[PDB]
Design a protein around this nucleic acid. Structure first.
Ligand SMILES: [Mg+2]
Ligand SMILES: [Zn+2]
Ligand SMILES: [Zn+2]
Lengths: 179, 148, 29, 67, 59, 100, 59, 260, 49, 115, 446, 99, 179
RNA sequence: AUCGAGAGGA
């Protein structure tokens, strides 16, 4: 199956063929009550004490529990969970390029970042969110240091000479209408 | 002459509770002559001391060879003769405690003078007759030189 | 033809990629 | 959108290196070896090429307003 | 009398904001409702609803 | 302030301690007036402080423990008087809004 | 826009990456938010601590 | 009571960088020299732009920002030009500015790259660094068929303290006490730390023994140029400029003393 | 009216903006931007002093 | 909005004095030198050269506020000497050091360019 | 005229919970569009700089100016009548740095001291005799901090790491760890300073300064602490990184052994319950005795693994540095980063069976064991497994709900209290009376 | 709770035995008892986490709640039943009905 | 920062004033270490370390959650091959004085986001602007030159101050003086 | 301009 999926662009073998082959099944919450889930195929292996020997299904990848905005977070399993919730809010407030055809649009408010970068550290879910193609930020060299005290209590010091070179520069468009 | 206490000490231990600080170490020493017990924090980064070193300790009310008071102000340009030139390590501090074994009816036989050299502490204890020069809130100089 | 643990990490992301190539993100709308 | 002229962190010119970078990834250099062939020795300059997204190529898919 | 907020202006601030707005789900409990129970993360959301993405206000 | 040497006998007579503390207590007034209602309410309003004052500033502790001199004790009495008067509540203080 | 290629969408000044899934009313882009409701045709039994019925079964 | 007699030893010299050691100076002098390389060596850069046509996909301030960052060859001309504040002209003249023009229209199905080669200057000694006779030209913008860019620009003397476009460096490496004999840095686990390239320690020794008498006395520089100036001209300009700042201060000080 | 316009109300001679740290102010100072200070006024009485 | 023009960090305003000398009244032989439109680049070298003078008892500088563009240099001397004289001598020493470093760098460049 | 330097303004952050939420400030005009605050006043405002806005009010007359100056200026607000203690204190970098600065083995060269003395606004201009003279003149950090301390105040405190036996063994007055703080005649004789000595607790140095000296002298004390310590920190530095979250292999092995033991103990208690060998303790249903015992085992395991993590840290560890200063964090945060995040609770109980007899379809039915019911056995550096992740999200959601829901009830209580007491006042006869002039108290307090 | 019955039991200590219900205290032991019990209960709530509030604030709240001889609630049913004037009452609750 | 670490820019320093590594890298942003320990956003530190490896190696680092093949020790070991300290610290030099900083500083590439919240959209001030028709008090909001609300809690605060004249000014003379 | 709704900040 994987070897057929790896040439999906040539053989026209698809996700639909994978469901039609009886390999993948759609399961609802009410049917999950009756299902026995392996978190990975490593749960299917023989073990020195067997927790369960009668699994019915396996997860594809555990990270699919996340939604769009939470999927942008790298290493979210190493954060206290409210901080993942706050990122899931603030990622919707980040400037980027919001859509490619923005030049024809007359949105009342629009922010466009000059130099979006894709992140150097990415989840694999970010491929499907097109974040690689409409990114909303810049990879910044960050030092974690006290220095002169102007960064205390959730504040940051920026390099003015980087800002002169266009770091985090943006354009703001406001549209007016009259008849 | 302004000298309050002079004796020769042998380093019996160093940091016996372990290394509490990296650049400072606590000596435990005993006099040979007056049988005083000394505890002394030393900046061993600039003046290293080894177990069983022998040194001469002077405590003085002034560095000047003639009797003259100290205003406690750092003048590096003062060219008066100074006993600091006979010694290798010199500290400045104030006496903050004098404990003793005195009772309600008897004077102390033993005294324990405590000095802070900017937070480097010293306790010198022994027979009271050797410590009568120490007074609380007096400024004092420690002068120390190793003996071969 | 069992997928061994060394192949599993590429295999499951091939599967997920095939899903998103088919369905996309607003399929339910 | 388009490659920055300068590395934000140190001011090295990188705005002449993007088309060469693409012409080294074609011909099967690794991204590391491509950056090293371009002389991008500091990670702050490498960050600029490795993380760039050339969205101007998409903006050029739209016809101009004036012919 | 009609239930409000079923249609909203599509958020366009950034592409993630657009995608997430198209995938939004609402529980019509009412923003002022003080009962914690329907706001808790229920176990059965596993794989159905994102555990992290919720607005930290009254909603 | 007065460079008290703890290791020497003091010049402070213990009767000056007894009298000074009696006289100080008369200057720490919370309820004014000579009538027995005022006098009782004054005694009540300052009872715990006067117990603390008498027990802290007693002749035996002044001799054995604190070893203050006469000039230092004379200073201490004025200090206590001044700091007590500065602790009394000012009329117009909106103490309800403060408590809320 | 259905079935159009990226080139056709660009010729129409549309964005290939735009997901759709929204309406245009008076020029404003409007998204519908999914509304949770209790499932129909199912017997649920509930109880409450302070009412005149011990148990209620609703369909 | 008096001056140091510092010594210099150049270890590498190229068109791109100069590596050198200063020895028998104070750390404050070494740092102020490092700072002057960044902030106070003047070069020529575009600072006034007028756009006659811009049908590109980038807005005019984006184009102007990019033009300001293009490095211009400055070596012998920047010492001659006045600042526009000191110059007597009403706005611009050859004594305080260099004029540039660009005029590109795309007429072809292939995408036209607009580059620092399309900038044409009125002064033959002040040209874009990439245009000097390899490294490619800096990309300004890409034009689709029928898009046009046409502009006129003036370049002015300035220094990096005013804007980073006038910074001539592309990195200043600076180091002292490579083996931590002064213990100005203190490592919790010295064996974890990689050796400096200037280390003289054998590979079994993590750091030198503590020196209670030493102070910083030898400083290693790598000054890399953005190309507007030769690296050695960056260094010599910085030494001249710092000396001038001190002489100007002494002139004002001596007036202030005479006024008292 | 009572809570909304009498026990509290909107006021002239007031300003609002983001706060930021400044370790170089004393505890009793506030750093104010120049546009705010130019917009707000105080009516000083004219005297020979 | 309230952006200061970037040249305000190094250009004097009309009537702004470059340097002002005030006596420190609390100890003898001491002055504050207030220098406008200068930063750590001059403050740190002047302070460090003053500390090389054995007749200087105190030398220090501060930038009072990083959005302001002035430095204060405090100097105290022995009573046979003057803080104005110390400050003048320090600047002369720095100028001589930089002139020697410049000439030696020109020589090192010439040697490197042709062996 | 336009507002200018030294104008008096009321500065306010909403919600205005108490009298320190509106205070009088002197205007300083600065470039750029923000208001700017000193960092000590962030505590009484409950302010931080993550995007907060504050409100400025300019009093329009000489009378309201004099009233704000004489009543409400920040220096006069340093001590609160709510709790007879300072409302503002040293915080963040200044507190971590002042802890480091007052260590016994901090030594300053002549030029560094003369730099620091530029930031004492109240320095008398005299350079103190260095604690060390002959090999090289060096000043200690305690010696320079002593010049910051105002007047001749006297204060005993303990540093946060002071042993509990040291006050009774030998060396009581010559603390080996430098953990006894004595300030005497205005000089810091000994001791490391932390939140115990410079924080908002009663009997701190800032409290004693406010009681012994003016508000004005104490205002200068807070200012000089911040400026001097922040300029030393440009030398000393402070950071945090991955290297502070890592323990040694011995610590990880002892943690893993303790977890494995706790899990075996839970299996044993489960077997005793299944066999009905488990006997109900009095007043509790068997289910509640089982829950009590499993929660006891897993809390003991979390405490022991945390202690094992805490004792592994070197004095260079930056989490330890921020915890012992009290500037930020706690021993539990260290324990969770390094050792074990621990049990996740909802409504004070282990994770409920939201699926039929299951927490998730990944477990078997009736699994009362630790992993099933939401014991996270990993640390935040190891990273959570998917079920641990989802249970930790269930836990954090409850804190977000409580943060959003508690506020209406508490604010309504605050309103009702004010409206009940707003006109109660001390009268000129020193009785406390309401608006109808009825006696509430014959003397305030009593 | 049934304080009056329990106090009269043969081995119950009648000096120390107490409720946490303040209305029971007021009914059985009277207004000064509930003045002391209300202070105890508020102190217990405030101090449970180790927080400290100066006694005079608690004392003044409890005196406000008890100076009329009956338990006055911090609610419209208490505050707006005092002899305070109608404009004071209308600033709290029941604004129009008060007037 | 993607990890719930938000803040406002407190000051900007030019490149000569920022701290620098021995090779002349200065941070683009300095963030305070006190942001980390109570937030426990360790994913931020791992992102920084992984990004430093990523930028040196020239590979986009995988930060997908629940990947047992990636851990902090493996990232540290990879970093040690590029000549950096394995935990991401570097020796920084003070920009003002040039002295080495005693503590080594954690430094590396971290993805940062500009949020739509900018100060010039929020700054506001009023003196004697327009008033509402009905109540004649100041307008509401920036966009109307409105006045800030001095509310009931502010009233209660000034009562507790005893500031009767200022309370009179704010609740009468500065709002709706009438006869 | 008002009223209503929705989305956000601390
Ligand atoms: Mg905030
Ligand atoms: Zn770079
Ligand atoms: Zn000209």
């Amino acid at each position: 199956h994987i070897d057929q999926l790896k040439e999906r662009e040539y053989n026209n073998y698809s996700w639909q063929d994978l469901v039609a082959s009886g390999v993948v099944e759609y399961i609802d919450t009410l049917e999950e009550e009756t299902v026995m889930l392996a978190m990975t195929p490593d749960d299917l292996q023989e073990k020195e004490v067997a927790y369960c020997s009668t699994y019915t299904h396996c997860e594809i990848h555990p990270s699919m529990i996340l939604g769009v905005c939470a999927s942008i977070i790298p290493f979210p399993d190493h954060n206290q969970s409210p901080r993942n919730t706050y990122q899931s809010a603030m990622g919707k407030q980040a400037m980027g390029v919001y859509i490619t055809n923005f030049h024809v649009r007359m949105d009342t408010l629009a922010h466009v970042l000059y130099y979006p970068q894709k992140p150097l550290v990415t989840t694999r879910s970010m491929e499907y969110l097109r974040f690689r193609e409409l990114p909303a930020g810049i990879n910044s060299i960050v030092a974690i240091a006290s220095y002169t005290g102007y960064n205390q209590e959730d504040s940051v010091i920026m390099n003015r000479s980087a800002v002169d070179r266009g770091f985090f520069r943006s354009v703001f468009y406001r549209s007016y209408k009259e008849q | 002459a302004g000298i309050l206490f002079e004796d020769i000490f042998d380093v019996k231990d160093i940091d016996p509770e372990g290394k509490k600080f990296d650049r400072v170490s606590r000596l435990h020493c005993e006099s040979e002559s007056f049988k005083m017990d000394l505890i002394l924090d030393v900046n061993i980064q600039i003046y290293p001391v080894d177990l069983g070193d022998k040194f001469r300790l002077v405590i003085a009310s002034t560095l000047y060879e003639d009797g003259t008071l100290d205003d406690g102000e750092y003048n590096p340009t003062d060219d008066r003769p100074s006993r600091a030139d006979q010694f290798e390590y010199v500290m400045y501090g104030k006496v903050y405690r004098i404990e003793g074994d005195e009772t309600s009816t008897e004077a102390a036989t033993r005294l324990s003078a405590y000095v802070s050299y900017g937070g480097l502490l010293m306790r010198l204890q022994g027979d009271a007759n050797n410590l009568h020069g120490f007074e609380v809130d007096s400024r004092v100089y420690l002068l120390m030189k190793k003996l071969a | 033809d069992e997928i061994t643990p060394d192949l599993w990490q590429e295999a499951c992301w091939i599967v997920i990629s095939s899903y998103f190539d088919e369905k996309g993100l607003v399929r339910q709308q | 959108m388009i490659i920055p002229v300068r590395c934000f962190t140190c001011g090295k010119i990188v705005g002449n290196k993007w088309e060469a970078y693409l012409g080294l990834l074609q011909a099967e250099y690794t991204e590391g070896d491509a950056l090293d062939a371009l002389g991008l020795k500091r990670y702050c300059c490498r960050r600029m090429l490795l993380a760039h997204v050339d969205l101007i190529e998409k903006l050029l898919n739209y016809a101009p307003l004036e012919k | 009398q009609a239930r409000a907020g079923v249609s909203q202006v599509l958020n366009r601030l950034t592409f993630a904001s657009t995608l997430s707005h198209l995938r939004r789900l609402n529980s019509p409990i009412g923003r002022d409702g003080k009962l914690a129970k329907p706001r808790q993360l229920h176990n059965t959301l596993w794989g159905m609803v994102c555990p992290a993405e919720t607005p930290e206000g009254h909603a | 302030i007065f460079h008290i040497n703890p290791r020497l006998p003091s010049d402070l007579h213990p009767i000056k301690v007894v009298e000074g503390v009696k006289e100080l207590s008369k200057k720490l007034v919370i309820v004014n007036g000579d009538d027995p209602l005022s006098r009782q309410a004054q005694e009540n309003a300052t009872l715990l402080f006067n117990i603390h004052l008498r027990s802290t500033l007693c002749s035996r502790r002044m001799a054995e423990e604190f070893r203050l001199s006469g000039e230092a004790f004379d200073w201490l009495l004025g200090e206590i008087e001044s700091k007590f008067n500065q602790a009394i509540a000012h009329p117009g203080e909106m103490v309800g809004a403060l408590a809320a | 826009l259905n079935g159009l290629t990226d080139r056709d969408l660009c010729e129409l000044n549309e964005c290939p990456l735009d997901p759709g899934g929204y309406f245009i009313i008076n020029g404003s882009e409007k998204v519908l938010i999914a509304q949770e409701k209790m499932a129909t045709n199912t017997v649920y039994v509930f109880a409450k601590k302070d009412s005149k019925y011990a148990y209620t079964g609703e369909c | 009571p008096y001056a140091n007699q510092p010594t210099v030893r150049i270890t590498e010299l190229t068109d791109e960088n100069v590596k050198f050691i200063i020895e028998n100076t104070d750390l404050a002098v070494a740092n102020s020299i490092r700072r002057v390389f960044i902030a106070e060596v003047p070069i020529i850069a575009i600072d006034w732009v007028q756009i006659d046509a811009n049908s590109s996909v980038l807005h005019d301030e984006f184009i102007a920002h990019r033009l300001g960052l293009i490095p211009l060859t400055s070596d012998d001309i920047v010492d001659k030009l006045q600042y526009s504040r000191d110059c007597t002209c009403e706005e611009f003249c050859p004594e305080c500015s260099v004029e540039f023009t660009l005029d590109v229209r795309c007429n072809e199905d292939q995408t036209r790259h607009v580059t620092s080669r399309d900038l044409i200057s009125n002064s033959p000694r002040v040209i874009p660094v990439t245009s000097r006779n390899e490294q490619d030209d800096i990309l300004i913008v890409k034009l689709r068929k029928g898009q046009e860019l046409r502009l006129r620009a003036y370049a002015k003397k300035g220094f990096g303290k005013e804007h980073a476009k006038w910074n001539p460096t592309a990195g200043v490496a600076f180091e002292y006490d490579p083996d931590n004999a002064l213990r100005h840095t203190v490592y919790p686990k010295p064996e974890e730390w990689p050796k400096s390239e200037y280390s003289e320690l054998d590979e079994d020794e993590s750091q030198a023994p503590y020196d209670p008498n030493g102070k910083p006395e030898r400083f290693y520089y790598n000054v890399e140029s953005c190309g507007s100036l030769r690296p050695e001209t960056i260094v010599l300009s910085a030494l001249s400029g710092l000396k001038k700042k001190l002489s100007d201060l002494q002139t004002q000080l001596s007036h202030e003393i005479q006024s008292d | 009216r009572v809570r909304g316009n009498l026990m509290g109300k909107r006021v002239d001679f007031s300003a609002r903006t983001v706060i930021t740290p400044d370790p170089n102010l004393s505890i009793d100072q506030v750093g104010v931007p120049r546009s705010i200070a130019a917009n707000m006024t105080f009516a000083e009485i004219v005297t020979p002093f | 909005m309230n952006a200061p023009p970037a040249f305000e960090s190094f250009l004097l305003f009309e009537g702004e004095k470059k340097i002002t000398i005030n006596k420190d009244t609390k100890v003898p032989n001491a002055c504050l030198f207030t220098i406008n439109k200068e930063d750590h680049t001059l403050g740190n070298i002047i302070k460090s050269q003053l500390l090389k003078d054995p007749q200087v008892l105190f030398a220090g500088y501060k930038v009072p506020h990083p959005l302001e563009h002035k430095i204060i240099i405090r100097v105290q001397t022995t009573p046979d000497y003057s803080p104005q004289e110390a400050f003048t001598n320090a600047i002369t020493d720095l100028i001589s050091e930089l002139s020697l470093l410049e000439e030696r760098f020109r020589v090192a460049i010439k040697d490197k360019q042709e062996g | 005229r336009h507002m200018c330097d030294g104008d008096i303004v009321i500065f306010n952050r909403q919600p205005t919970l108490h009298k320190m939420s509106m205070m009088g400030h002197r205007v300083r005009i600065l470039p750029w569009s923000t208001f700017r605050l000193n960092l000590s006043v962030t505590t009484p405002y409950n302010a931080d700089f993550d995007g907060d806005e504050m409100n400025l009010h300019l009093p329009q007359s000489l009378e309201t100016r004099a009233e704000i100056q004489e009543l409400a200026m920040v220096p006069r607000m340093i001590v609160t009548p709510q709790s007879n203690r300072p409302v503002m204190g040293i915080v963040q970098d200044t507190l971590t740095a002042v802890r480091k600065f007052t260590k016994r083995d901090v030594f300053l060269e002549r030029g560094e001291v003369m730099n620091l003395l530029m930031f004492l606004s109240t320095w008398d201009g005299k350079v103190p005799q260095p604690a060390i003279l002959k090999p090289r003149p060096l000043w200690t950090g305690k010696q320079i901090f002593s010049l910051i301390i105002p007047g001749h105040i006297n204060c005993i405190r303990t540093h946060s790491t002071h042993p509990d036996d040291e006050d009774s063994g030998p060396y009581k007055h010559i603390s080996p760890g430098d953990t006894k703080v004595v300030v005497e005649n205005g000089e810091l004789i000994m001791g490391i300073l932390c939140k115990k000595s410079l924080g908002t607790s009663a009997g701190s140095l800032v409290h004693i300064s406010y009681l012994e000296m003016g508000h004005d002298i104490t205002r200068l004390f807070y200012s000089n602490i911040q400026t001097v310590i922040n300029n030393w920190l440009l030398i000393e530095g402070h950071t945090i990184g991955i290297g502070d979250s890592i323990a040694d292999s011995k610590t990880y092995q002892d943690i893993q052994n303790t977890i494995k033991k706790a899990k075996q103990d839970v299996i044993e208690v489960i077997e005793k319950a299944h066999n009905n060998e488990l006997e109900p303790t009095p007043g509790n249903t068997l289910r509640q005795t089982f829950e009590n015992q499993v929660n006891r085992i897993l809390n003991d395991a979390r405490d022991k693994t945390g202690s094992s993590a805490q004792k592994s840290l070197s004095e260079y560890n930056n989490f330890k540095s921020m915890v012992v200063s009290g500037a930020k964090g706690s021993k539990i945060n260290i324990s969770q980063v390094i050792a074990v995040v621990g049990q996740q609770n909802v409504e004070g109980k282990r994770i409920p069976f939201g699926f039929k007899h299951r927490t998730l379809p990944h477990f078997i039915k009736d699994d009362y064991g630790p992993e099933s019911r939401g014991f996270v056995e990993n640390s935040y550096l190891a990273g959570l497994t998917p079920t641990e992740f989802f249970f930790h999200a269930m836990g954090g959601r409850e804190g977000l709900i409580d943060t959003a829901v508690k506020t209406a009830e508490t604010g309504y209580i605050q309103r009702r209290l004010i409206k009940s007491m707003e006109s109660v006042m001390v009268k000129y006869d020193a009785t406390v009376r309401n608006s109808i002039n009825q006696v509430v108290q014959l003397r305030y307090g009593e | 709770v049934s304080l009056m019955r329990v106090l009269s039991e043969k081995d119950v200590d009648p000096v120390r035995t107490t409720s946490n219900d303040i209305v029971e205290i007021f009914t059985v032991l009277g207004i000064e008892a509930v003045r002391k019990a209300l202070e105890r209960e508020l102190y217990h709530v405030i101090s449970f986490d180790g927080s400290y509030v100066n006694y005079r604030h608690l004392a003044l709240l409890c005196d406000t709640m008890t100076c009329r001889g009956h338990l006055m609630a911090i609610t419209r049913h208490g505050v707006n039943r005092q002899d305070t004037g109608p404009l004071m009452k209308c600033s709290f609750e029941e604004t129009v009905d008060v007037l | 920062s993607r990890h719930g670490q938000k803040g406002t820019c407190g000051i900007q320093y030019r490149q000569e004033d920022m701290p620098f590594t021995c090779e002349g890298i200065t941070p683009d942003i300095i963030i305070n270490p006190h942001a980390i320990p109570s937030r426990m956003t360790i994913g931020h530190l791992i992102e920084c370390l992984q990004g430093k490896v990523s930028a040196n190696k020239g590979e986009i680092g995988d930060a997908t959650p629940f990947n047992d093949a990636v851990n902090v020790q493996k990232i540290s070991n990879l970093l040690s091959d590029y000549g950096y300290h394995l935990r991401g610290n570097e020796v920084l030099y003070n920009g003002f004085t040039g002295r080495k900083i005693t503590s080594q500083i954690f430094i590396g590439p971290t993805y940062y986001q500009r949020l739509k919240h900018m100060v010039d959209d929020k700054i506001h001030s009023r003196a004697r602007g327009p008033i509402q028709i009905l109540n004649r008090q100041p307008m509401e909001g920036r966009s109307r030159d409105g006045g800030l609300r001095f509310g009931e809690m502010e009233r209660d605060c000034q009562i507790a101050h005893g500031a009767a004249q200022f309370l009179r000014e704010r609740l009468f003379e500065a709002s709706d003086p009438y006869q």
